[PDB]
Design a protein around this ligand. Structure first.
Ligand SMILES: OC[C@H]1O[C@@](CO)(O[C@H]2O[C@H](CO)[C@@H](O)[C@H](O)[C@H]2O)[C@@H](O)[C@@H]1O
Ligand SMILES: OC[C@H]1O[C@@](CO)(O[C@H]2O[C@H](CO)[C@@H](O)[C@H](O)[C@H]2O)[C@@H](O)[C@@H]1O
Ligand SMILES: [Mg+2]
Length: 580
DNA sequence: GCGATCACGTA
DNA sequence: GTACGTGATCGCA
């Protein structure tokens, strides 16, 4: 049942039609400066397989690749685009990306290869990449006959599937979402990943030595307090010391033993001095292993830059994820960890890091979607939302709001966005269900619009089978009808949260597209480096800071128009840490 | 070599 | 109670 195709030894005119399914295969998971093992082109004239050495050296082919008028349909065009950027070749004219199309149609499918997307439309004349390349150690590029066959079948699948996918996207009112949001963003993410972020490796290594020193001290202190040595990083060995040798109370159990999570340890601190030391060890050890050593392992030795890969088709809510390294979870909450950011520096001398972040975008989005009068007014007055919530749920004036009252109102606001639950709020604020329930009840009394939204959105998820975001992203919630309380409740929380987190994702994605257009129009050298859900990190000549101070916030604030204003704070400095 | 567990970093 | 990714340990191949 082999598929017919030409194993070309040279590029020909018919291979450069103005519309084609293109496969520029990069097998290495991390495509940065990675090899392109083969190329397949399927168009009106037939199916072709070209060896990369040949194709990429052919002037006509490279010109075809960069010609925006020559339209290409692909799967994960960003992967190809970045791999090509590393070879100094521009990819343009990608009008359809099956990966992104599949992702928008149903994020839950976990589509990560052409075969998975094709299976959505009962097309199975293509093999899963894992079947062809294997995984782990067994992973390898098969001989040309097998490789060529696979790439051609993928291009053929893309060629056949474009119409049906676009048709369904259109029915879902997601056609613009793909064409005007995700696909253009893909090119922006490609530029960001390729540009990378410069790392001050000397600073990291210095912090590592200081940490190693402190860690040794705390480590020895722990052995001294426990009366023996053991693997502190072993929750099993640690559990024996804590709950057996030291007789500390067992307040929380895990699935396979005693729990030793930070939340549990905090409660045990009053009983033994060893606890605070374990907590300190946990903090320093996390920085050392994950942010000092982990980061140093992925820094390109030549450029000293880290090139993350933003997975644009993974999260169930529309957010991006970041890997190798993850640049969306660099420490900031605790000062010791926050200093890690001093290692992220501008890529050129006399340039600076500029960071802009939305202030409470999720709650502003909630105010908009729920049309809660009280909540919308609060933002229209740009009030401290946590103090305002405390004032309302505890019924007091601003001056009567104590720090603990704001702390709890803050916790309530988080729960509301995540899918409020008396049990959940209880565990978080360490109080009884009855108490937590009363807080939630008080919240809804003050924000009836939000209560109505939470009730209505769950009902809608059940009626339609899914929930949507501001820009029409969708997430199916089949569990919304489960007769199992736990399974159903999780789906209900997703119904409440997805439109919020998802709409916030839509907004910043459009902001990125709008920003890049503005930067180009102004011919600024400034460029995006990272996106961390509700913030954009750029770098630019120190001479562009004043213009960026006005331009970036405005573009982000004007990405979409809501019933409440969007507010963006911004800072800049010599390092990411200093952009505060 | 792999993957389940537990842990913890972010918004 | 939302959404993620990475690393140390550990027991089975
Ligand atoms: O290229 C990113 C794109 O590829 C997928 C598979 O189609 O993920 C692959 O590449 C990621 C980046 O290296 C890895 O984290 C992942 O494990 C690997 O399968 C998509 O999920 C993603 O959108
Ligand atoms: O008591 C109604 C109240 O319960 C929630 C869960 O907190 O939903 C339950 O009741 C609905 C009927 O009104 C069902 O459709 C739903 O499946 C069930 O879990 C809230 O959404 C609702 O306001
Ligand atoms: Mg913020």
């Amino acid at each position: 049942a082999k598929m017919a195709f030409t194993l070309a030894d040279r590029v020909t005119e018919e291979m450069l039609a103005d519309k084609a399914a293109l496969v520029v295969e990069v097998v290495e998971e991390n495509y940065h400066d990675a090899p392109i093992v083969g190329i397949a082109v399927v168009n009106e004239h037939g199916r072709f397989f070209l060896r990369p050495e040949t194709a990429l050296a052919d002037p006509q082919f490279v010109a075809w690749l960069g010609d925006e008028t020559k339209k290409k349909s692909m799967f994960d065009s960003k992967r190809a685009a970045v791999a090509l950027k590393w070879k100094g070749i521009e990819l343009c004219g990608v009008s359809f990306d099956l990966l992104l199309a599949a992702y928008l149609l149903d994020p839950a499918q976990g589509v990560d290869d052409v075969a998975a997307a094709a299976k959505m439309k009962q097309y199975e004349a293509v093999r899963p990449d894992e079947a062809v390349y294997g995984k782990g150690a067994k992973r390898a590029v098969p001989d040309e006959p097998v490789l060529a066959e696979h790439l051609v079948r993928k291009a053929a699948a893309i060629w056949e599937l474009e119409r049906p996918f676009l048709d369904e996207l259109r029915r879902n009112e997601q056609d613009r979402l793909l064409v005007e949001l995700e696909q253009p963003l893909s090119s922006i993410l490609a530029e960001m990943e390729f540009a990378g972020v410069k790392v001050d490796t000397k600073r990291l290594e210095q912090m590592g030595k200081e940490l190693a020193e402190q860690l040794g001290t705390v480590e020895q202190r722990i052995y001294e307090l426990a009366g023996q040595e053991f693997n502190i990083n072993s929750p099993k060995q640690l559990g024996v010391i804590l709950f057996e040798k030291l007789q500390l109370p067992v307040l929380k159990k895990t699935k396979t033993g005693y729990s030793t999570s930070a939340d549990v340890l905090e409660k045990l601190a009053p009983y033994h001095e060893i606890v605070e030391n374990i907590l300190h060890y946990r903090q320093l050890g996390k920085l050392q292993s994950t942010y000092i050593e982990g980061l140093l392992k992925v820094v390109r030795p030549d450029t000293k830059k880290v090139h993350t890969i933003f997975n644009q088709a993974l999260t169930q809510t529309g957010r991006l994820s970041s890997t190798e390294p993850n640049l969306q979870n660099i420490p900031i909450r605790l000062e010791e960890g926050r200093k890690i950011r001093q290692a992220f520096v501008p890529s050129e001398s006399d340039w600076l890091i500029f960071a802009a972040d939305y202030s409470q975008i999720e709650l502003r989005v909630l105010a908009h979607i729920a049309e809660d009068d009280n909540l919308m007014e609060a933002f229209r007055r740009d009030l401290d939302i946590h103090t305002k919530t405390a004032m309302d749920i505890f019924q007091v004036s601003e001056d009567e709001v104590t720090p603990n009252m704001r702390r709890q109102a803050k916790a309530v606001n988080f729960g509301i966005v995540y899918g409020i639950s008396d049990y959940g709020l209880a565990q978080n604020l360490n109080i009884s269900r009855k108490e937590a329930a009363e807080f939630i009840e008080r919240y809804f009394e003050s924000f009836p619009g939000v209560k109505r939204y939470m009730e209505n959105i769950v009902q809608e998820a059940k009626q339609k089978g899914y929930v949507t975001t501001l820009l029409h992203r969708r997430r199916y919630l089949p569990d919304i009808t489960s007769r199992n309380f736990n399974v159903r409740s999780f789906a209900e929380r997703m119904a409440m949260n997805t439109p919020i987190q998802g709409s916030a994702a839509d907004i910043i994605k459009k902001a990125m597209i709008d920003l890049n257009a503005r930067l180009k129009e102004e011919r600024l050298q400034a460029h995006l480096l990272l996106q961390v859900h509700d913030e954009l990190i750029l770098e630019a000549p120190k001479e562009e800071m004043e213009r960026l101070c006005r331009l970036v916030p405005e573009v982000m604030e004007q990405a979409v128009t809501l019933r409440v204003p969007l507010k963006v704070d911004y800072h800049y400095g010599s390092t990411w840490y200093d952009a505060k």
